[PDB]
Amino acid sequence: LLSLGGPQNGAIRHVAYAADAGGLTISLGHLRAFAKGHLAGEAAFADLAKRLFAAQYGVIVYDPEEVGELGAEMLQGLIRDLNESTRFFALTLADPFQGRAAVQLSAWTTGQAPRVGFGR
């Protein structure tokens, strides 16, 4: 169990990695660079990249609200780079206000996502 941006000391035993000064979105881009082999070794995220590629079924759990549109596209890209070696996936967290069902319903009723207008 590896954690980026999570609490350092928890009841559950895990290997915590410190988030960068910029934020989780900056850290996510920082991490993908080591996974692509673009940055020199012996760094914090370099060990993380080594541990991810050494996988059998990899899952990156994140909340798109707190990570942001840019971070998620980067996070989803990091998974595309990871799948060149082993199988990796993302566990996109669901909102607690039925928003994900609204997307499902709006998609098959209107043909598009929510935030749709019928003025015309």
- Count the residues of the shown chain that bind another protein, applying the rule CB under 8 A: 23
Q: Longest Cα pair distance anywhere in the chain, in angstroms? A: 58
Does residue 77 belong to the site contacting another protein (CB under 8 A)? yes
Does residue 36 belong to the site contacting another protein (CB under 8 A)? yes
Alpha carbon distance 3, 22 (integer Å)? 17
Phi and psi, residue 4, nearest 5°: -115, 115
Does residue 38 belong to the site contacting another protein (CB under 8 A)? yes
- The site for another protein (CB under 8 A) is made up of 20-22, 25-26, 29-30, 32-33, 36-41, 70, 73-74, 77-78, 117, 119-120
